[PDB]
Ligand binder design. Sequence first.
Ligand SMILES: Nc1ncnc2c1ncn2[C@@H]1O[C@H](COP(=O)(O)OP(=O)(O)OP(=O)(O)O)[C@@H](O)[C@H]1O
Ligand SMILES: [Mg+2]
Length: 224
Amino acid sequence: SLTTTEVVMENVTAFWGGTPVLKDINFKIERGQLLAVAGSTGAGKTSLLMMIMGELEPSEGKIKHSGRISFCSQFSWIMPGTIKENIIGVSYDEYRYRSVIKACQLEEDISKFAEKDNIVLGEGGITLSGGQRARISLARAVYKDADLYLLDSPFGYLDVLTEKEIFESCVCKLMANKTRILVTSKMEHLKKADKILILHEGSSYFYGTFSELQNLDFSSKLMG
Ligand SMILES: Nc1ncnc2c1ncn2[C@@H]1O[C@H](COP(=O)(O)OP(=O)(O)OP(=O)(O)O)[C@@H](O)[C@H]1O
Ligand SMILES: [Mg+2]
């Protein structure tokens, strides 16, 4: 056999010097796979993403990953400049740009404005709706040519329909061959995931496929 593992955590424990934020974490992710990371507020989901990114180092165990990371943060900031510039930053690629703005449902929002994608934003994008900031932040993350996409609750401030459609068009369709970790509140997203990690108070409550989760609970109460 030929291996294509992209990310490995082996017996990982980490502290932000008291009680562990993550303890005995084990998982692997293969190239092109979607891992859904679930769990209640404060369970350690963003801290896990931080470990992959080098911001949080393990006290015990090993993290194996090599590749470019694209991160969509919670409370993601809008920088001064146009919506386009907020999405594309440095590299111009019109085909990729169009596919991303379509998949994140920004086409209509941009088509309504006078200058279209060329309307200049302030710091924070306070003149945008919360949903608009969320979709621009996701689009920025998805547009980046990366080897690992860390999508940290990108749908939180979206209505249920908009969330469903963007999960489909963006996470599932546009990003089908991309190694993705999605931190998500939804059972529907767990069903479509290649793997699921449920965290609870810093440790793994469940790791496995959706069939395996189905065979079991707490998860049924925790998800929307
Ligand atoms: N940079 C940091 N420095 C110190 N403590 C942190 C840091 N980031 C998170 N924590 C703490 O670690 C715990 C886990 O937080 P984390 O952000 O990983 O939770 P989460 O599961 O992503 O929660 P939510 O669903 O609310 O985003 C929290 O108590 C938090 O206060
Ligand atoms: Mg978080």
